[PDB]
Scaffold this active site. Structure first.
Site, PDB file in Angstrom:
ATOM      1  CG  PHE A  34      -2.324  -0.517   0.800  1.00 55.02           C
ATOM      2  CD1 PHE A  34      -2.599  -1.515   0.247  1.00 55.02           C
ATOM      3  CD2 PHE A  34      -3.546   0.555   1.271  1.00 55.02           C
ATOM      4  CE1 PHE A  34      -3.843  -1.988  -0.136  1.00 55.02           C
ATOM      5  CE2 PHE A  34      -4.841   0.053   0.910  1.00 55.02           C
ATOM      6  CZ  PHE A  34      -4.869  -1.048   0.443  1.00 55.02           C
ATOM      7  CG  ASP A  72      -6.708  -2.614 -20.556  1.00 57.49           C
ATOM      8  OD1 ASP A  72      -7.728  -2.396 -20.959  1.00 57.49           O
ATOM      9  OD2 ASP A  72      -6.192  -3.702 -20.902  1.00 57.49           O
TER      10      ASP A  72
END
Ligand SMILES: *[C@@H]1O[C@H](CO)[C@@H](O[C@@H]2O[C@H](CO)[C@@H](O)[C@H](O)[C@H]2NC(C)=O)[C@H](O)[C@H]1NC(C)=O
Ligand SMILES: *[C@@H]1O[C@H](CO)[C@@H](O[C@@H]2O[C@H](CO)[C@@H](O)[C@H](O)[C@H]2NC(C)=O)[C@H](O)[C@H]1NC(C)=O
Ligand SMILES: *[C@@H]1O[C@H](CO)[C@@H](O[C@@H]2O[C@H](CO)[C@@H](O)[C@H](O)[C@H]2NC(C)=O)[C@H](O)[C@H]1NC(C)=O
Ligand SMILES: *[C@@H]1O[C@H](CO)[C@@H](O)[C@H](O)[C@H]1NC(C)=O
Lengths: 431, 438
Positions: free
Chosen positions: A249, A316
């Protein structure tokens, strides 16, 4: 000897980076402000954990020497982490071995509960991912391996399925480190006991209720709304162990806010025949006059991102993210690379369009690419060597590794075309 | 005379559609099951309205609401069948367009997919493409619901993160014009949509029970009434629309039946992206991709691939590169028609034609007989597509919806579609290309 060792011992991978960091204004977080914020979250978690366990052990203390703490405090104007960083090595090992203490859904998926609408479900979305918390209070995004065949997911179109999803997150970080971009969060593979390390540690009653035992005696959990939408809805241990990717994170958006910016080259266009889109410079001539691409660093950072995406075949990258504190010209964060490494036998040169249209590249970037094309530092060799450290080795099969060499040669041949048209002085920008 | 009138009086637009409707199993909703569901929602709404009006101290004036079967939106829902969203030359649709245009509102709220993004602000889920933030769902006096998408007003200097050539400037005009083209093509697959100039004070602020939506209304320094979205504002994207000082133009799209009554699936578009093939065969001309898709369920059956080819023709005509997914009703199975929702990304570039959208047609080289005949007719001067579109759009309150360059681009793209069919017929013959219907 070792080509990966030779790469990081090479003079190029030991050149100090300019301008050198001036301490305060060049770091992402303020140490004292961030540490008291983390200490409040730890006291919050101990308060939540004490009441929960009483409704049915010594407390947790925020240790400054934790890998993720030093990771956050290490983020600076030059990237997410430092070159040849021992803190990164420890964080990879900690994510691979540390036990978990909590598990939950991702915040963006707690919303789709639900109130089931298939529009917001079949969106690049990994709906079975979970956020794990380790014993050192660090958090990682766990993306499990895709297990269900497309016969079990009638709505999914075969050639769009993220079969390589967990391998792609891992391999994208190793390529990021080898390229010395240092722009994607550290990521490891891990074989996870879904019973011990997820079901038995979560306080989320919804996540508890979605676990079940397979008719084949395997432990599984499922997502209800994806199942009704006939897309991917379940992963299982065999009977307990399930392999996936763990991505570290970044700091909480309270400490370091982020912006999402659309990629102006996410789509290609059919120009009036027969001038090719990737070679025609008119589009980038216009983008160069549009803020914030009028300054040099931002466009060069996007060109770096397109080179990276071309190497892994990622079509993408609809948006890229930046830290607010570093303003414009700040580096771009290359998050969520799960759509890479899906096609080893096809090269989408339209991804390289920023480079082939604008015809400019960082001197540092070109030098690293030129070195990784030499046999002694071959990109596929150092990548294969680097990925052997991971618990899910080899992570990448041989076709994907060999495609890295072919796409690297295509990037270099593209730079040659730009230099023929405009000269080295115009193409190769210095820092 | 009137070319639009001639088009729908033409024999082609009066051919009965095969196979004929068998009543029950061919309608989307069961009338008695759907009507009692709507009667419960109306009783629910009246309970909330009496209780709410008491918490904020307002005299419960006026009689309660009654679910009237003859309401336009009720007949619209009961009219949905295996052949499309609505009927050809339907007086029910004409009445529904007028009702959405004139009926007053009684409630307003956020769409459910945006009630989730009231957090916990994360710019990843906010700056996604094809997303129209600041849109609202309105409820009319006949209990019908429409999605109100306000006109894009802010220039890109006010939205520093937005990239100029991706901004939905034509957003509200595109929703309107996409429905009119849908009716003219006789696809009948997009929900009825009208333009409306809305008094944001009377018809949104003063009718909503949502305290969050109430709190975001404010008075502009130029003395205009505005409401804003906080999370988009922090993400430096489009975040505010304003009346001038009260009136705001936008598009209104009629709601489909509740997902409880008619569930829908979202299916990815296999041609949403183009690919640079290894030289030197062009992507739009190479049939290998569709040769493979033809062997992949559910595209192995004839109807599904022909429906996708219809959708690509439509998307090419309006220049919509953002059909990432299409939707279907569960009840009509695999062979059911495709719903063409959320066309806000169309009609953005009148001077460019993206032939890669036509890739299903140019690769698979097959087309519906009905579809090809309607296109051939709309290419003739007496039924010219730009003429009947311009004539049709005059009915709307925001006329002119499309400027002349957009209208003329419809004729140019129509010629490209038909010239593409000629190429397929040269390669494979009419028997292979032009498929007939069961
Ligand atoms: C994964 O974890 C589960 C639960 O911690 C392990 O299963 C337990 O095994 C012990 C004996 O070693 C039993 O006393 C428990 O009753 C078991 N629990 C369940 C739910 O079966 C399992 O062995 C672990 N698998 C590994 C580590 O590979
Ligand atoms: C790129 O464009 C932006 C905005 O157009 C420039 O940023 C500011 O621009 C305004 C006027 O456009 C000036 O008054 C400010 O002084 C600019 N801010 C500065 C210079 O910090 C930006 O400067 C442009 N890029 C470059 C390299 O000049
Ligand atoms: C739009 O709605 C507003 C609000 O109902 C109307 O303004 C009201 O009517 C008159 C005109 O100013 C005032 O005496 C009221 O006090 C207004 N109310 C509020 C709350 O401002 C307005 O007339 C309507 N029409 C237009 C064109 O703005
Ligand atoms: C299409 O393929 C599916 C495969 O499951 C089959 O069941 C179906 O009958 C096929 N339909 C046609 C029309 O070929």
């Amino acid at each position: 000897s070792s080509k990966l060792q030779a790469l990081f011992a090479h003079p190029l991978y030991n050149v100090p980076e300019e301008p050198p960091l001036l301490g305060a204004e060049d770091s992402l977080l303020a140490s004292q402000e961030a540490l008291r914020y983390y200490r409040r979250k730890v006291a919050r978690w101990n308060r939540r954990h004490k009441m929960y366990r009483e409704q049915m052990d010594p407390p947790l203390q925020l240790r400054l020497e934790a890998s993720w703490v030093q990771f956050h405090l290490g983020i600076n104007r030059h990237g997410l982490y430092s070159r040849s960083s021992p803190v990164v090595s420890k964080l990879l090992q900690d994510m691979r071995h540390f036990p978990t203490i909590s598990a939950d859904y991702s915040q963006d998926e707690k919303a789709l509960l639900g109130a089931c609408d298939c529009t917001q479900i079949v969106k690049s979305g990994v709906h079975l991912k979970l956020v794990l918390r380790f014993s050192d209070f660090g958090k990682a995004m766990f993306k499990p391996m895709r297990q269900q065949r497309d016969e079990e997911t009638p709505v999914d179109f075969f050639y769009f399925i993220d079969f390589q999803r967990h391998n792609a997150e891992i391999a994208a970080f190793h390529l990021d480190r080898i390229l010395d971009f240092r722009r994607v969060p550290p990521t490891v593979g891990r074989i996870v006991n879904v019973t011990k390390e997820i079901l038995e540690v979560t306080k989320n009653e919804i996540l508890q209720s979605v676990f079940f035992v397979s008719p084949a005696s395997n432990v599984c959990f499922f997502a209800k709304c994806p199942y009704m939408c006939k897309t991917e809805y379940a992963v299982c241990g065999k009977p307990h162990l399930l392999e996936g990717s763990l991505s570290a994170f970044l700091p909480s958006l309270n400490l370091a806010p982020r912006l999402s910016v659309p990629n102006p080259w996410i789509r290609s266009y059919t120009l009036a025949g027969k001038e090719e889109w990737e070679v025609n410079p008119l589009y980038c001539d216009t983008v160069k006059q549009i803020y914030p691409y009028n300054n040099s660093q931002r466009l060069l950072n996007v060109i770096d991102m397109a080179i990276f995406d071309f190497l892994i075949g990622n079509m993408d990258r609809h948006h890229y993210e930046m830290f607010t504190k570093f303003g414009d010209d700040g580096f771009l964060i290359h998050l969520d690379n799960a759509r890479g490494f899906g096609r080893h036998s096809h090269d989408e040169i339209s991804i390289l369009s920023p480079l082939s249209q604008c015809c400019m590249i960082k001197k540092k970037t070109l030098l690293h690419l030129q070195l990784l094309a030499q046999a002694d530092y071959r990109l596929s060799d150092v990548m294969r060597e680097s990925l052997l450290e991971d618990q899910l080795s080899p992570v990448l099969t041989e076709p994907h590794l060999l495609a890295l060499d072919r796409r690297l040669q295509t990037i270099l041949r593209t730079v040659e075309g730009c230099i023929v048209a405009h000269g080295q002085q115009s193409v190769i920008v210095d820092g």
